[PDB]
Amino acid sequence: GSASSQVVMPPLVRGAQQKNGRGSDSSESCWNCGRKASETCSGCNAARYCGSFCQHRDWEKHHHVCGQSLQ
Ligand SMILES: [Zn+2]
Ligand SMILES: [Zn+2]
């Protein structure tokens, strides 16, 4: 029973921007379930999430999207 080296999904933060855009502009769906997304990945902030349970399920497929800054 050791932590070893395992990558876990980070919690989704609540996005709030007004300077650029007024709601989303580009895309507006949850990567996991696709039903109205209003939060972002606290890590890369690239993927869209609506809940913690959604992020975990999609986390397997997020492994290649996280840690890639913006390219
Ligand atoms: Zn969702
Ligand atoms: Zn991420």
Curated annotation (Swiss-Prot):
Zn(2+) 1 binds at residues 30, 33, 50, 54. Widely expressed with higher expression in heart, pancreas, skeletal muscle, spleen, thymus and peripheral blood leukocytes. Expressed in hematopoietic cells (at protein level). Induction: Down-regulated by all-trans retinoic acid (ATRA). Zn(2+) 2 binds at residues 41, 44, 62, 66. Homooligomer. Homotetramerization is mediated by nervy homology region 2 (NRH2). Can interact with RUNX1T1 and CBFA2T2; heterotetramerization between members of the CBFA2T family is proposed. Component of a TAL-1 complex composed at least of CBFA2T3, LDB1, TAL1 and TCF3. Interacts with ERBB4, HDAC1, HDAC2, HDAC3, HDAC6, HDAC8, NCOR1, NCOR2, and ZNF652. According to PubMed:12242670, may not interact with HDAC6. Interacts with PLXNA1, PLXNA3 and PRKAR1A. Isoform 2 interacts with PRKAR2A, PDE7A and probably PDE4A. Interacts with ZBTB4, ZBTB38 and ZBTB33. Interacts with HIF1A and EGLN1. Nervy homology region 2 (NHR2) mediates homo- and possibly heterotypic oligomerization by forming a four-helix bundle tetrameric structure. Belongs to the CBFA2T family. Transcriptional corepressor which facilitates transcriptional repression via its association with DNA-binding transcription factors and recruitment of other corepressors and histone-modifying enzymes. Can repress the expression of MMP7 in a ZBTB33-dependent manner. Reduces the protein levels and stability of the transcriptinal regulator HIF1A; interacts with EGLN1 and promotes the HIF1A prolyl hydroxylation-dependent ubiquitination and proteasomal degradation pathway. This is Protein CBFA2T3. It comes from Homo sapiens (Human). The lineage of its organism: Eukaryota, Metazoa, Chordata, Craniata, Vertebrata. The gene is CBFA2T3. The chain holds residues 551 to 597 of 653 of the full protein.
